[PDB]
């Protein structure tokens, strides 16, 4: 009947990410005797990068220690010996050279796999991975100290040039600075390739089956967008997000992703639901938003299918 | 934070045998071979033989088949060297390496 | 086991002149060498890895290059801080056999 099944296989998100794409903590972990909150999604979240606000340290830097105050870092990995953030791909599959598997992995996988590896604050007994960042361009593998993705408040933060050690206002986004950027949680698949979303499809626009035909999306919610980018950015922006008082307390930097108070221990869910899927209207300039699987493509030479997890930029 | 952490310098008599510790912390050695490496005083690295963790596979130069014994941890993230009849040509800087990341080496000596 | 001939074992260099060192597989190792440094007293440090590739943090001074059983490590141009002992390494296949080092003399 319908010649698009496993064609579509890979946009069916709830099924093939099963997390937040704006914000990923589909799971919960224990480090030494907390549950915190850290992203779960099986697939790789392209283009997607954190701003830091009213800020000139990009968040690939590594987080604030010793001296450092908190604002003058980013979200990765600080610098300790040996070595293991920023990693380039050259050097992993150096360091995993013995290991058939792991060395032959995309760089993608590779990358989730090496993060993978890090035991989090001394605690072996926990499942608690750290999220990643490959940079396609360097062809480096950046790991994530903070798992947290958005702190947004007039309360929650501080925007200031004085407050140096105060909490960053910070949100998920996809920025042209992010275009190589991929985030990757301790899930993603082997087989991410196969079974998940990487570029948009040109000469396409996504439908629903009915009735051995293709039809339009029923509920559609649409926005000007200039280009391809920019529509891919808005439904990331509305996408699947796991993401959550009157104060940033404790338990709100819990809520949020957040697992440590400057080296010591702080003491929902989307499964993938959400509005994840664009179809580009490269005509008329508009971003036709939806939030239920598509099953089928309508081939139309104005539209340009596109996802939260897909590229912003590539298309086949 | 990754550290690793060699085991303290040891003396024993020759015919004895040794057993030396490699601990890796803050990160899980599974993926990753545990090589050994000899240096004994002023002269160069011997290359003794290497562990896959992951599967308890140790493979070494036959020079040290039947001196070294390379074992390794996955629960523990340590890798240990056993050395068997011990001797003077044993006396000998020893490291361990994650795979291409060097311990600080512990110091063997062999004697009476 | 594969022999790695590393040579020259001793090389007196002036602060800011080449250092050339060779290292040749008694077999074809592919593109699988290693140059570490030792400095006294103190454990190994990668430079260079797969025969031509400079690991993060090691100096554009330091480079080599090679496919197959001839190897050269280079210091273009050496500084005092460079006094060590280098080592090649194939790890091709096991043994993964070191050469025999080069120890760095600075001429003053």
């Known amino acids: 009947g319908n010649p698009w099944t496993e064609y579509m296989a890979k946009y069916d998100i709830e099924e093939v990410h099963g997390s937040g794409i704006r914000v990923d903590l589909g799971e919960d972990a224990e480090v030494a005797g907390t549950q915190y909150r850290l992203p779960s999604g099986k697939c790789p979240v392209f283009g997607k990068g954190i701003i830091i606000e009213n800020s000139n340290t990009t968040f690939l830097t590594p987080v604030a220690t010793g001296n450092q105050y908190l604002k003058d870092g980013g979200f990765a990995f600080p610098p300790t010996e040996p070595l293991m953030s920023p990693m380039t791909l050259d050097e992993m599959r150096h360091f995993y050279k013995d290991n058939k598997y792991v060395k032959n992995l995309d760089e993608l996988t590779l990358c989730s796999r090496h993060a993978g590896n890090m035991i989090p604050d001394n605690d072996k007994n926990s499942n608690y991975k750290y999220p990643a960042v490959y940079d396609d361009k360097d062809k480096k593998c950046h790991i994530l100290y903070i798992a947290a993705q958005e702190n947004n408040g007039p309360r929650y933060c501080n925007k200031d040039e004085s407050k140096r050690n105060s909490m960053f206002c910070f949100r998920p986004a996809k920025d042209i600075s992010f275009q190589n950027y991929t985030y990757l949680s301790k899930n993603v698949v082997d087989n991410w390739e196969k079974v998940c979303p990487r570029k948009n499809l040109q000469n396409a626009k996504f439908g629903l089956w009915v009735d051995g035909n293709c039809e339009d999306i029923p509920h559609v919610n649409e926005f000007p967008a200039i280009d391809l980018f920019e529509c891919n950015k808005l439904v990331f922006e509305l996408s699947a997000s796991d993401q959550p008082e009157q104060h940033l307390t404790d338990y709100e930097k819990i809520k949020e992703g957040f697992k440590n108070k400057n080296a010591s221990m702080i003491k929902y869910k989307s499964h993938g639901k959400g509005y994840n899927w664009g179809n580009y209207n490269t005509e008329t300039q508009k971003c036709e938003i939806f939030n239920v699987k598509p099953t089928c493509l309508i081939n139309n030479s104005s539209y340009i299918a596109t996802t939260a997890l897909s590229h912003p930029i590539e298309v086949e | 934070e990754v550290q690793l952490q060699q085991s303290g310098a040891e003396l024993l008599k020759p015919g004895a045998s040794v057993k030396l510790s490699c601990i890796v912390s803050?990160?899980?050695?599974?993926?990753?071979?545990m090589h050994w490496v000899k240096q004994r005083p002023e002269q160069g690295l011997e290359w003794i033989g290497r562990?896959?963790?992951?599967?308890?596979?140790?493979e070494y130069d036959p020079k040290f088949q039947g001196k070294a014994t390379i074992t390794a941890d996955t629960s523990s993230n340590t890798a240990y060297l056993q050395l068997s009849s011990l001797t003077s040509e044993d006396t000998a800087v020893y490291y361990c390496?994650?795979?291409?990341?060097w311990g600080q080496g512990t110091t063997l000596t062999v004697s009476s | 086991s594969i022999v790695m001939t590393q040579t020259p074992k001793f090389l007196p260099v002036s602060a800011g002149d080449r250092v050339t060192i060779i290292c040749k597989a008694s077999?074809?190792?592919?593109?699988?060498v290693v140059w570490y440094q030792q400095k006294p007293g103190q454990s190994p440090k990668l430079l260079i890895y797969?025969?031509?590739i400079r690991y993060t943090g090691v100096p554009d001074r330091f480079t080599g290059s090679g496919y197959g059983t001839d190897f050269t490590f280079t210091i273009s141009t050496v500084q005092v801080e460079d006094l060590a002992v280098y080592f090649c390494?194939?790890?091709?296949?096991?043994?993964?056999?070191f050469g025999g080092g080069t120890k760095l003399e600075i001429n003053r």
């Open positions: 390496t994650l795979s291409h990341f």
């Open positions: 803050g990160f899980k050695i599974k993926d990753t071979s």
């Open positions: 562990i896959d963790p992951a599967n308890d596979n140790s």
């Open positions: 077999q074809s190792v592919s593109n699988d």
């Open positions: 797969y025969a031509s």
């Open positions: 390494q194939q790890g091709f296949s096991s043994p993964r056999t």
